[PDB]
Amino acid sequence: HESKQSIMQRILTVFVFTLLIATVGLFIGQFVPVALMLPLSILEVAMIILAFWMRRRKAVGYAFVYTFAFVSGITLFPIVSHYASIAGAYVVLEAFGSTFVIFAVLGTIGAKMKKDLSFLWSFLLVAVLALAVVGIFNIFSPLNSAAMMAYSVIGTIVFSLYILYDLNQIKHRHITEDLIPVMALSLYLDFINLFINLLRFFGILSS
């Protein structure tokens, strides 16, 4: 019989594996010919939309989540390479570093705090959808640096709050073992979207 603790530990274990697998994917993605990379603006907003779409009470399996992590890692190279090119490759380390401690701190707080943050659910969904709208607008009417920097600040706040919220709800809600992959999937998309936002912000800032 599972405990709240074991279920949490299993979700976090899967989550860490998704990060490792995405990193392998990122490494492979460097070998994709430029003429076979999707446009930056399309990839950036695709991850936001995926963050929304994958947030369902539907039991996806480990195969989907791990494969998703592998392929999204491959497809995130053009984003990493773009911001590296305008600001140096060190900004990739900076962005990852910041994303890591933010997730680590907010996830720990969310999972340990007594307050139930469920009321945030509708606010957060609206916010991510708003980020999606702007990301789509950006495709057809490119935002300038100042606007894109402000876009990344909002996104940073939204996904940082989602990390606090997600770990909190994993503790507070009834999470069965079959929901383990989909929970880790949401954490992975929290991480990658926060990373994209911070990468973009710091990239543009030091460009």
Side-chain angles (χ1 to χ4, degrees), residues 91-106:
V91 74
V92 180
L93 289 74
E94 292 182 316
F96 174 84
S98 294
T99 307
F100 193 83
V101 339
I102 289 182
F103 193 108
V105 176
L106 297 188

Side-chain angles (χ1 to χ4, degrees), residues 2-56 58-65:
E2 294 291 322
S3 75
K4 285 168 66 268
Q5 168 179 302
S6 59
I7 287 173
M8 174 78 74
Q9 183 182 346
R10 285 171 70 185
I11 293 171
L12 290 178
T13 293
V14 180
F15 165 64
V16 166
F17 288 146
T18 66
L19 292 181
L20 260 347
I21 290 162
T23 299
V24 178
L26 176 53
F27 179 82
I28 300 297
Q30 79 178 268
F31 300 114
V32 175
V34 173
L36 297 192
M37 294 170 178
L38 279 309
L40 174 72
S41 57
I42 289 176
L43 295 170
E44 295 180 342
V45 75
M47 298 304 181
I48 301 298
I49 300 180
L50 284 167
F52 174 75
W53 194 243
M54 297 303 186
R55 195 167 284 275
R56 295 166 298 173
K58 167 190 178 181
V60 301
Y62 293 98
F64 179 85
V65 176

Side-chain angles (χ1 to χ4, degrees), residues 80-195:
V80 169
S81 59
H82 178 262
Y83 294 103
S85 78
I86 77 174
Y90 186 71
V91 74
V92 180
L93 289 74
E94 292 182 316
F96 174 84
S98 294
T99 307
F100 193 83
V101 339
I102 289 182
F103 193 108
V105 176
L106 297 188
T108 300
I109 294 180
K112 258 81 172 60
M113 60 188 288
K114 303 303 176 183
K115 184 172 190 175
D116 192 334
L117 294 175
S118 63
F119 66 94
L120 290 179
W121 77 270
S122 68
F123 172 83
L124 287 170
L125 283 176
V126 167
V128 171
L129 290 172
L131 295 175
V133 174
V134 170
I136 293 170
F137 181 85
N138 183 50
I139 297 167
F140 302 93
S141 179
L143 308 177
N144 62 33
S145 297
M148 192 62 55
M149 219 152 22
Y151 178 61
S152 305
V153 174
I154 303 290
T156 293
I157 293 167
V158 172
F159 286 106
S160 291
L161 190 57
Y162 245 131
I163 296 163
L164 187 70
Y165 169 84
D166 281 338
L167 271 307
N168 183 260
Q169 289 307 280
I170 293 172
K171 181 185 67 172
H172 276 111
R173 303 279 69 81
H174 182 62
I175 305 305
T176 53
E177 59 187 2
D178 67 328
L179 293 176
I180 288 180
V182 70
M183 290 303 141
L185 180 54
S186 270
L187 297 185
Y188 171 72
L189 279 161
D190 285 351
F191 189 96
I192 286 297
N193 284 282
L194 177 56
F195 172 72

